From Swiss-Prot, chains B, F, I:
The modification N6-acetyllysine is found at K1, K21, K44, K80, K87. Core component of nucleosome. Nucleosomes wrap and compact DNA into chromatin, limiting DNA accessibility to the cellular machineries which require DNA as a template. Histones thereby play a central role in transcription regulation, DNA repair, DNA replication and chromosomal stability. DNA accessibility is regulated via a complex set of post-translational modifications of histones, also called histone code, and nucleosome remodeling. It comes from the Eukaryota. This is Histone H3.1. The modification Phosphothreonine is found at T45, T72. The keyword RNA-binding does not apply. The modification N6,N6,N6-trimethyllysine is found at K1, K21, K44. The modification N6,N6-dimethyllysine is found at K1, K44.
Swiss-Prot record, chain C:
It comes from Homo sapiens. The nucleosome is a histone octamer containing two molecules each of H2A, H2B, H3 and H4 assembled in one H3-H4 heterotetramer and two H2A-H2B heterodimers. The octamer wraps approximately 147 bp of DNA. The modification N6-(2-hydroxyisobutyryl)lysine is found at K27, K65, K66, K86, K109. It comes from the Eukaryota. This is Histone H2A type 1-B/E. Keywords: Acetylation, Chromosome, Citrullination, DNA-binding, Hydroxylation, Isopeptide bond, Methylation, Nucleosome core, Nucleus, Phosphoprotein, Ubl conjugation.
Swiss-Prot record, chain E:
The modification N6,N6,N6-trimethyllysine is found at K2. Core component of nucleosome. Nucleosomes wrap and compact DNA into chromatin, limiting DNA accessibility to the cellular machineries which require DNA as a template. Histones thereby play a central role in transcription regulation, DNA repair, DNA replication and chromosomal stability. DNA accessibility is regulated via a complex set of post-translational modifications of histones, also called histone code, and nucleosome remodeling. The chain holds residues 20 to 103 of 103 of the full protein. The modification N6-acetyllysine is found at K13, K73. GO terms for biological process: chromatin organization; negative regulation of megakaryocyte differentiation; nucleosome assembly; protein localization to CENP-A containing chromatin; telomere organization. The modification N6-(2-hydroxyisobutyryl)lysine is found at K13, K26, K41, K59, K61, K73. The modification N6-butyryllysine is found at K13, K26, K59, K61, K73. The modification N6-methyllysine is found at K2. This is Histone H4. The modification Phosphotyrosine is found at Y33, Y70. There is a cross-link at K13 (Glycyl lysine isopeptide (Lys-Gly) (interchain with G-Cter in UFM1)). Its main location: nucleus.
Swiss-Prot record, chain G:
GO terms for molecular function: DNA binding; protein heterodimerization activity; structural constituent of chromatin. The modification PolyADP-ribosyl glutamic acid is found at E9. Monoubiquitination at Lys-8 (H2BK34Ub) by the MSL1/MSL2 dimer is required for histone H3 'Lys-4' (H3K4me) and 'Lys-79' (H3K79me) methylation and transcription activation at specific gene loci, such as HOXA9 and MEIS1 loci. Similarly, monoubiquitination at Lys-94 (H2BK120Ub) by the RNF20/40 complex gives a specific tag for epigenetic transcriptional activation and is also prerequisite for histone H3 'Lys-4' and 'Lys-79' methylation. It also functions cooperatively with the FACT dimer to stimulate elongation by RNA polymerase II. The keyword Ubl conjugation applies. This is Histone H2B type 1-K. The lineage of its organism: Eukaryota, Metazoa, Chordata, Craniata, Vertebrata. The chain holds residues 28 to 126 of 126 of the full protein. The modification N6,N6,N6-trimethyllysine is found at K59.
Length: 87, 100, 120, 98, 84, 100, 99, 87, 100, 65
DNA sequence: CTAACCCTAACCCTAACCCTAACCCTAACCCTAACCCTAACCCTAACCCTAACCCTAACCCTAACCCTAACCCTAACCCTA
DNA sequence: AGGGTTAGGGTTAGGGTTAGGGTTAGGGTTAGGGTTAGGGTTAGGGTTAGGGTTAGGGTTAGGGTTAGGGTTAGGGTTAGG
């Protein structure tokens, strides 16, 4: 059966070519070596905050499933209104 | 333009032009799906994430990363430079008012 | 009849107008129905926040050899408390200055400046 | 003609009482009292607005203690939110008991 | 009688220098005063336009500190003390 | 022939400390009132402002200028410099999101 | 679903009619339709909140065309706000002339 | 397949009467209510500091099992030599 | 009706004497094993501890807690008090050199 | 660290005082060399809040109010 | 009248297996940027003091806020198409 | 059914006015030290590749979970004193 769970091979999930392609899409020609760790840390902090907000919303809604509507509500409460996914 | 060696700095411009005309996701879903589940474990266990929540999360994260990279690139050329550095991301985040 | 009229503040143990909070929640066009424990909860939260802020201001005034609370001491305590600064980030206190924070580069380390004549 | 001037509502007596409860030797100027009055009103309007948004999102036309506890945990940070939640729970427990 | 050209110059150079010293600036360039005056004029124009709109909506002809605080909070700058 | 002239730096530092350890205002009141009156003249004529209104306006303007000067000084320090520059002010306004 | 379920609300028909009026022989996508619906809902909620705040500040209880026009002039920029105000005044005049 | 409780004893076991039994061994008569959390915290940090050295000692011999000998060897470095169990 | 309730003090004293005149343990074994397993999970995965190892760990932890409680009680007695306090624990850890 | 301390103290040479200052400033260095005392070196001017003048209000009696 | 109760219909979330194939990791070579040193200028640091000017201390009064008195139209709730 | 509208007078209040002297800025002056120009050093990743870990569907099942509908009762509402 499934006798395993998730580990810390998760910060390393944000691979280096992915961050490089994101910087190239933004407009960066040369990317330093110590940028990947800081980017992963900032992304982890942001995801932690958004997931905490979504968990609070789900606990207030008396539910156990996080929905895209709750995610959009949390993102708008922070100050980032997202369109398309939801309504 | 021999296929053995290309001038460094020229292939990056073509890559930038090619990647700036597409709307596909750069971060992959399966590595990003486990990061969302691993963070939600500290708050409350036995949680079921919808198929549309991870997509919006990835889209928002990609947009935020693109904005931060653009801000860092704008801060890089200020000091007569062309490359980004970790000492620039801190200032770019502090001026925006996120780190406080 | 009616025996006696006890105050809601005395029955709740708080020092905030629960009746005024309920009236503001009913006339503020927030919802058609206003609960009973919600005004008490809000009054308790506001009282705790006010008590913490007043304690910080009194500590700052006692450290500044003063007896009264001034907006300068209020701003100093707000900027000192990390949670208060994160809560009230977009709030500017009138008649109050910032903290005397001098960077290390701005400090005077000319080191004879050099570049001039050979002082060897 | 008639007197009957409008009365402006303020929380000056409650702030002074909290001051005497915490530090019974200090004072509060008029500017500090006005700052504390604007801080209490701004937080009260932010929490009431967050509770109204939660009552409008979930199809329910009421505001109970859970809506305020959720608005407190979403607005206040960490230790302050937990302390405020504990104080509110103690208050509602003393109300439901006495 | 008031010279509309003698109002940007009202923000004197020593005033801007003292403001930069209070913020934490050691050396102030020469071309900073004009840009600071322009930015301050744009911000004051926006805030005064918001206050004028609020006063016209209130069917009044006097701009009040309450309306100024309301406009400042609508823009994203909550000010305490002056008002309530 | 020695008035003991101060080297450029100590006077600026002590002035910064003296202005930081105070709560009084810096800009005058009557010129600011004339300025806001001239600005309000471009919208509705025959307007009467308020003393508390112009005082709050001056306070908010002084706070915004202090924040902008702090951001510019931080950008200059990051750029291996000690003086502010219009390019630094422009970059600060571009990162903060005021450019429009 | 169709098992005594509930029906949501949207503005797809109005958006499609506006698109057909401003430009014939064009098309649209579901993502664009959802984005337009979210934008319309966000602007609607913002203008409604601004009008409610203005009515509460004016010590009144009715949000009318004047409050809506003030909220529009405060939210929208310059020429867009002017054109929106002109269109709203024309619509109000048409409603007053014929109902 | 896997335990539904992934808390893995979040600093549990150190209950109120358990601390109320160790403090009375020393001579504490009145035990404050704000002492249980600090006791759990200091116990957690001590166990962390000891387990770090234990894992560092066990990882040297390419071994995946922690024995009592490595535990007492790591405890000797901290300044607390235990007799009997190790040997 | 009567149960002859003991005044606060004699029960604590007799419990102190009974627990001092014994050699058995106080903390349980399975919760401590789960705790040390959770702590070891943060370093190397798939770890197998030992019964004697966790027993020695529990014994050393109990001895350290007893010493800390003795130091805290001594500090409280010196401070004209009879109950322990977190400030007393902090001062004991500061003097002993354990810091944080 | 010693050179940074000397440059901050308007000095060119490294002295044991600057060495002790840098050691006490660096948390990892202080944790590594905890039982090491540097000769010809003082501690940091750390004054507690209770030792500062006022706050305690030394008026005591104050005949009046 | 709306929220706390119960049965329960159906949905949507998770568990698990495949088939490679776009993508990810390292190590192989090398070009040009980040960075330290240094030196030339001209820019703003530091007065400065006599003139600009502002806020101090009051008077007023006439345009403006709105208060409470009268009155009716606009807004809501009802039902039912 | 009462909130908003109208006319009416009170009533605070801000603009307009005086003068002056004490605070402070305006424009020109001496000169220090920081700035961006330069050239030399170094290693920092840019670019290619080929071994190969792992991801997007493709297509299943099961049983948690939201809540649709119905019942009912009690807390918020409204009113006056």
């Amino acid at each position: 059966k499934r006798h395993r769970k998730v580990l810390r091979d998760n910060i390393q999930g944000i691979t280096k070519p992915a961050i490089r392609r994101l910087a190239r899409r933004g407009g960066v020609k040369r990317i330093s070596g110590l940028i990947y760790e800081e980017t992963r840390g900032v992304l982890k902090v942001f995801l932690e905050n958004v997931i905490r907000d979504a968990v609070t919303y789900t606990e207030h809604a008396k539910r156990k499933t996080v929905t895209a509507m709750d995610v959009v509500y949390a993102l708008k409460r922070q100050g980032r209104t997202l369109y398309g996914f939801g309504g | 333009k021999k296929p053995h060696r290309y001038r460094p700095g020229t292939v990056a411009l073509r890559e930038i032009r090619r990647y700036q005309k597409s709307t596909e996701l750069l971060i992959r879903k399966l590595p990003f799906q486990r990061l969302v589940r691993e963070i939600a474990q500290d708050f409350k266990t036995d949680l079921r994430f919808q198929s549309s929540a991870v997509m919006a999360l990835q889209e928002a994260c990609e947009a935020y990363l693109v904005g931060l990279f653009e801000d860092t690139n704008l801060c890089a050329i200020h000091a007569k430079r062309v490359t980004i550095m970790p000492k620039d991301i801190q200032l770019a985040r502090r001026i925006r008012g996120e780190r406080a | 009849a009616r025996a006696k009229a006890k105050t809601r503040s005395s029955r709740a143990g708080l020092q905030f107008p629960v009746g005024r909070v309920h009236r503001l929640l009913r006339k503020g066009n927030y919802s058609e129905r206003v609960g009973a424990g919600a005004p008490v909860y809000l009054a308790a939260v506001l009282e705790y926040l006010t008590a913490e802020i007043l304690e910080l201001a009194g500590n700052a005034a006692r450290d500044n050899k003063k007896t009264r609370i001034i907006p300068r001491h209020l701003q100093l305590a707000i900027r000192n408390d990390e949670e208060l600064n994160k809560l009230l980030g977009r709030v500017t206190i009138a008649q109050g200055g910032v903290l005397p924070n001098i960077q290390a580069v701005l400090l005077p380390k000319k080191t004879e400046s050099h570049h001039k004549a050979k002082g060897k | 003609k008639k007197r009957k001037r409008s009365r402006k509502e303020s929380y000056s007596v409650y702030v002074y009482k909290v001051l005497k409860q915490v530090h019974p030797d200090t004072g509060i100027s008029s500017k500090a009292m006005g700052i504390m009055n604007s801080f209490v009103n701004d937080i009260f309007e932010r929490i009431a607005g967050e509770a109204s948004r939660l009552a409008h999102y979930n199809k329910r036309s009421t505001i109970t203690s859970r809506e305020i506890q959720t608005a407190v945990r979403l607005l206040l940070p960490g230790e302050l939110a937990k302390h405020a939640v504990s104080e509110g729970t103690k208050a509602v427990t003393k109300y439901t008991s006495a």
